Amino acid sequence: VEATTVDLWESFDRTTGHHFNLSIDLNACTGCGACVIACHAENNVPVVGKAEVRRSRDMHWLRIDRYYSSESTFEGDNERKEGIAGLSSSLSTFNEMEKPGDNPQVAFQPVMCQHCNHAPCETVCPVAATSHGRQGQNHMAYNRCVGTRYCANNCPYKVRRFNWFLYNKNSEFDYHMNDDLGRMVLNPDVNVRSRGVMEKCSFCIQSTQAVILEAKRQGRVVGKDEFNNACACSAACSSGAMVFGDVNDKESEVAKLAESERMYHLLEHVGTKPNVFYHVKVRN
Amino acid sequence: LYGCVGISVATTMMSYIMIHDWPQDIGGKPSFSFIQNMPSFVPIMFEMTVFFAAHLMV
Amino acid sequence: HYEAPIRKPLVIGDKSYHDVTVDVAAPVEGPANKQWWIVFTIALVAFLWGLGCIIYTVSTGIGTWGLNKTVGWAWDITNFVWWVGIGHAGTLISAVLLLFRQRWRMAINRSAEAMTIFSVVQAGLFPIIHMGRPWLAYWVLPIPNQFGSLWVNFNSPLLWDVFAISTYLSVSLVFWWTGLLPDFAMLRDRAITPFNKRVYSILSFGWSGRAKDWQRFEEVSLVLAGLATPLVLSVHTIVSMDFATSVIPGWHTTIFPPYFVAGAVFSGFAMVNTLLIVMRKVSNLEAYITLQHIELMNIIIMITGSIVGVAYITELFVAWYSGVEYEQYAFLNRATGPYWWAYWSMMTCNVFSPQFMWFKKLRTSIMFSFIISIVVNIGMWFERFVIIVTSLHRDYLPSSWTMFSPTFVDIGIFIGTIGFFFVLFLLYSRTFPVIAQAEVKTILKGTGDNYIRERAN
Amino acid sequence: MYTFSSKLKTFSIILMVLGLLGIGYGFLSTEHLNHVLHQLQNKPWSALYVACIFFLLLSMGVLAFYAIQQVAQAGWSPVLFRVMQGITAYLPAGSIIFFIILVLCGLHFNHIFVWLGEGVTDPKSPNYDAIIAGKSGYLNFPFWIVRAFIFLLGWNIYRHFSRKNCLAQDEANDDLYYKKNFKISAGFLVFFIVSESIMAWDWIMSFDPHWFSTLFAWYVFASFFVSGITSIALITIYLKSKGYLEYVNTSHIHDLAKFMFGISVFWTYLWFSQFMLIWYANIPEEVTYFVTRIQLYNLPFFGAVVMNFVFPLLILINTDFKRLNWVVVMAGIVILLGHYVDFFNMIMPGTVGDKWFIGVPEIASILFFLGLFIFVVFTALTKSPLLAKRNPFIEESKHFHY
Numbered sequence A: 001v002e003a004t005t006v007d008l009w010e011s012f013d014r015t016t017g018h019h020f021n022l023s024i025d026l027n028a029c030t031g032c033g034a035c036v037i038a039c040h041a042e043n044n045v046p047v048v049g050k051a052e053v054r055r056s057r058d059m060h061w062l063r064i065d066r067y068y069s070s071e072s073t074f075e076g077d078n079e080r081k082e083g084i085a086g087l088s089s090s091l092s093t094f095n096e097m098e099k100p101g102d103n104p105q106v107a108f109q110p111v112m113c114q115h116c117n118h119a120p121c122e123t124v125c126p127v128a129a130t131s132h133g134r135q136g137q138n139h140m141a142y143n144r145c146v147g148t149r150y151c152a153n154n155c156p157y158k159v160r161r162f163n164w165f166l167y168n169k170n171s172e173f174d175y176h177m178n179d180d181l182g183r184m185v186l187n188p189d190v191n192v193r194s195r196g197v198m199e200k201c202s203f204c205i206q207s208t209q210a211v212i213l214e215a216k217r218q219g220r221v222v223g224k225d226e227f228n229n230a231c232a233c234s235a236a237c238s239s240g241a242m243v244f245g246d247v248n249d250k251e252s253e254v255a256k257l258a259e260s261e262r263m264y265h266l267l268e269h270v271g272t273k274p275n276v277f278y279h280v281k282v283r284n
Numbered sequence B: 001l002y003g004c005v006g007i008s009v010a011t012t013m014m015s016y017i018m019i020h021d022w023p024q025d026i027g028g029k030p031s032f033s034f035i036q037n038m039p040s041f042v043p044i045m046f047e048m049t050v051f052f053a054a055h056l057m058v
Numbered sequence C: 001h002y003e004a005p006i007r008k009p010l011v012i013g014d015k016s017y018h019d020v021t022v023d024v025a026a027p028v029e030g031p032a033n034k035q036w037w038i039v040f041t042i043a044l045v046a047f048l049w050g051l052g053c054i055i056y057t058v059s060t061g062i063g064t065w066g067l068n069k070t071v072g073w074a075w076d077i078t079n080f081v082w083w084v085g086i087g088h089a090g091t092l093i094s095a096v097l098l099l100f101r102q103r104w105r106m107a108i109n110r111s112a113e114a115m116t117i118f119s120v121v122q123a124g125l126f127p128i129i130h131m132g133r134p135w136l137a138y139w140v141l142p143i144p145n146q147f148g149s150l151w152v153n154f155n156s157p158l159l160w161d162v163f164a165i166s167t168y169l170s171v172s173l174v175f176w177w178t179g180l181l182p183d184f185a186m187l188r189d190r191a192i193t194p195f196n197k198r199v200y201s202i203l204s205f206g207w208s209g210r211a212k213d214w215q216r217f218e219e220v221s222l223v224l225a226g227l228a229t230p231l232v233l234s235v236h237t238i239v240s241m242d243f244a245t246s247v248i249p250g251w252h253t254t255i256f257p258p259y260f261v262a263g264a265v266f267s268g269f270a271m272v273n274t275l276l277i278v279m280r281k282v283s284n285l286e287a288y289i290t291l292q293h294i295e296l297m298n299i300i301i302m303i304t305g306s307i308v309g310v311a312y313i314t315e316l317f318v319a320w321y322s323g324v325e326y327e328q329y330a331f332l333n334r335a336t337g338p339y340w341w342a343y344w345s346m347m348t349c350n351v352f353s354p355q356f357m358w359f360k361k362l363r364t365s366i367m368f369s370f371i372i373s374i375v376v377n378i379g380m381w382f383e384r385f386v387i388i389v390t391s392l393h394r395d396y397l398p399s400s401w402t403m404f405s406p407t408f409v410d411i412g413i414f415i416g417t418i419g420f421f422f423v424l425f426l427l428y429s430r431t432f433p434v435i436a437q438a439e440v441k442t443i444l445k446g447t448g449d450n451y452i453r454e455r456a457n
Numbered sequence D: 001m002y003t004f005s006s007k008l009k010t011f012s013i014i015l016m017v018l019g020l021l022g023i024g025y026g027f028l029s030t031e032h033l034n035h036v037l038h039q040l041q042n043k044p045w046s047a048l049y050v051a052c053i054f055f056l057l058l059s060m061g062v063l064a065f066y067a068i069q070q071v072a073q074a075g076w077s078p079v080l081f082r083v084m085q086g087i088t089a090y091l092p093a094g095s096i097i098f099f100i101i102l103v104l105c106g107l108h109f110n111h112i113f114v115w116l117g118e119g120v121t122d123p124k125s126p127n128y129d130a131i132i133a134g135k136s137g138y139l140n141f142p143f144w145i146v147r148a149f150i151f152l153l154g155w156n157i158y159r160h161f162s163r164k165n166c167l168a169q170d171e172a173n174d175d176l177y178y179k180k181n182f183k184i185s186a187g188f189l190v191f192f193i194v195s196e197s198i199m200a201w202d203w204i205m206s207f208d209p210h211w212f213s214t215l216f217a218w219y220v221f222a223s224f225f226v227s228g229i230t231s232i233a234l235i236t237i238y239l240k241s242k243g244y245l246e247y248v249n250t251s252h253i254h255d256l257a258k259f260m261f262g263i264s265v266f267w268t269y270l271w272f273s274q275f276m277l278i279w280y281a282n283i284p285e286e287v288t289y290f291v292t293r294i295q296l297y298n299l300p301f302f303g304a305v306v307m308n309f310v311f312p313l314l315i316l317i318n319t320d321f322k323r324l325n326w327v328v329v330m331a332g333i334v335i336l337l338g339h340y341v342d343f344f345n346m347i348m349p350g351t352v353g354d355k356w357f358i359g360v361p362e363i364a365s366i367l368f369f370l371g372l373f374i375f376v377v378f379t380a381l382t383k384s385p386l387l388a389k390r391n392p393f394i395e396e397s398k399h400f401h402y
């Protein structure tokens, strides 16, 4: 039986009231270059120097990947592995499959915090700084987070960025966060973190709480492409790769993409129920 | 008898806070009842019964 | 009476009641020598320097440590669980050996208790020091407040750990303390100075040893020993579940709850044995700590070592048996990878050290067993290290793969806890009655190289 | 010596006839039915398997304890060793029957095991299962038989020579047999631990080739070791009440009562930790193991917790009650029933699933082996005197009190 049907627990009702998703199709991902800088524009992610990134301790909420291959194809890295012997060859094949061969194939993959439903990063927080909503986010409070760094470990995708120094006003980081003339880029609607608290690529709460707001004072229902135009993770990319919006509204752009033959999540055998689905690379 | 006091403390504490004051979701843990999500309370309930049984008789 | 002629004497030197009390009271009743002061000074300096490192990293940032965005735990919790493992030895010696009526424990129990009260305390520093905002640690407790009675959840093993450790220590403190009442009584009755007179009249309670008082005393210790064994198991198990309950390949399992416990017994006794070896020569109490006590410590270590060995092959079998590639790769990474030397040096120590004890010529040797007892602690440090690090730098999504290397402030804090351990233990040995008198005097007639010879003729 | 009752013979005969007849009765009764009919045909087969492995391991739970008591130089056990030797006479007979059953599976007379079916390994078949086929390096049938076979010799040989050397020690003017057995028992315990781990994989976890778990064998060990202790106590109570034991008193009973109590709690500990570590982080692979048990075997699954924990928890905690014959007998019965259920629960959902029931074919196999067990044990007690002769610790055990 499909792995998603096995569950010792009981689910929660998110069938009404704006269940969200987010849609990547891997064909449209050329380089996804400007999708990064627009996400670090509202969210006030600080700038780290050459050192403290040299030690692989940077601060980014979404990332683009880079996967080469050995022996010129991706199917050539699935014939060497499925044909394997016992413990004498498997110590040598897995050590040769990290050396990329000449003229391989390249593949890109945008990876952010897909807001899970059976989320492993939730249950182990002792101070209860994380929780879920009815819309289907992963709400991250910056207040109870007394930084016992568990929830960076149980994320199998491992997109969770703890901050280590104070990046705001000290002279060790003499970037735009420090000087008085250059603290005007920072928007007042999103707070600026100090020390010891984690941060995470949330869904665009500071926009979608204003889209519901501007559709409630008027007395209307939210339109078709109104959620898509506000979240700058999707409303700033060049191609039509990133698609954000509603699902319970059966006339949006997300609900026509979720019912497809390319419906596909990362790591379904883990059983975490993500809310961001990729499609398929259909190269020829 | 002191141990029996301890288990009543542990179970009335957790059954109040977790399911009758804020029944929020932390993960996919079913916080609908006290049978549901019971196993996660065992590590605490145990320790409380020993704690009271030990110190109150000393 | 009805004692078997097979058993060997536990008390050497034809010692009577006065002989025993004088021998044990003597190190308390006199001054410390120059060598004591030299060692004390060294331990103190290491401790003070360690404090400086702790203050520095708390006030400047966790980023001064060698932690990564991938590896959130290493050396902090590694040393935490290492010290916790050490602090289970005394609660076995004073409770489990009690439950199995093991007479030979009477010469160890008191120093064995010191081993837990000075090591659980060391472990208690790490849950605070590694925190991002430790001055807000009080939020861990479910205390009514102005945030609309904002509570804590009761689903995380980190919280379970708070209850496990704080009650483990609390209970063991009153247990060993109660056992001191008849021994402090024997010091207040010496009162060589009015100062010391006052001190021991306060340290002891109004313990005028009487029929009824002893009757109740015995019953209390039986109850607490009964409660203590469950605590030994459940506390280390709650610690174990910090990894067993995860979704990370290489950590998610069911073997850890008894596995880590077996390792805790193994490493704990290895530690205790080295201190007893030097203690019986410095304090001149070699007539109480005999080669039979040493041999029995070695035998127990041998037994638990083999249990650990079985668990190692259990995990490897299951990994092969399982069709999950992620679990199999994790074990391949340990066998061959950038941390191969941690894994194989760990395995070398844990596999071969306890197997030397099958040879009587090696087991019955204070020289050989001293060395081996030290080695065991090294292997066990790596046991904890390997599990945590090798399972995090390699996992789901190859793009997140990394390395790990500690900094001088990670090392320094660990050194500090070692120094502090010895400051506390060393001072203990010059102010407390190192051997229970109430216990030894109940076995002096039952066993010893005088009464047995009398029984034989 | 021990005079046989001259009544238990016919009693055990009745059990070995009525049980046997019930067993015989049990075998006389699109793609949907292809599932169902196998569930139905397996019912009288797993009804026998669970009975044999229960009593087989019951005997092993005594030998493990026996070896431990001699290695640990216990000063209260010598007076009870003859009873324990009498109990562990079942093993060299029960192990024959069990082994034969394993052979019958190999010869395709049933569908007890999945991976022993035909067409599973080969890709040229509608029965092809790649997951099982990938585990064939361990599940290969001839390896399974040989590996199982040598575990039986490794237990039976120990039993045989332990008794032989003991009797030799009884008729000697020096020692040499005591020390011989001391060395042998130490070797046995090492062997036992290794054979125990593999045994569980081959005889219990082999019912579900799509499931695995660490900490399985230690759980299994506790589930029979506890019951072994209670069977020791019950036989000594019987013999004592019939006037065949001397130098046995309530302190010996009390010591056994508190021993079995502590280890029954230990069983509960292992049970819970295995369950919770799957429930807490329910990664769907390897979770259906509990899904299909909780949803189907509801009362069996949870009733086994109560009977093996809650009941004795409020009984064998009073030290006065630990000295009472009827308290100990009562608790012993409940514990034995509870562990029978434990083995029932582990095996049944893999062979019959939701077609399970506790009717005639189940009861019949229980009574048959019950009678057999009784017959063999009490017959064995007539072949050697109770209360061994010169033994380095028997003089203190004859005056043991607590």
Ligand code: SF4
Residues within 6 Å of the ligand: A113, A114, A115, A116, A119, A120, A121, A122, A138, A154, A155, A156, A157, A158, A159, A160, A200, A272
């Ligand atoms: S992806 Fe990582 S951060 Fe987002 S919910 Fe799942 S575990 Fe938590």
Ligand code: F3S
Residues within 6 Å of the ligand: A121, A124, A125, A126, A127, A128, A129, A130, A144, A145, A146, A147, A148, A149, A150, A151, A152, A197, A198
């Ligand atoms: S588990 Fe909790 S305290 Fe912060 S580090 Fe993660 S939100």
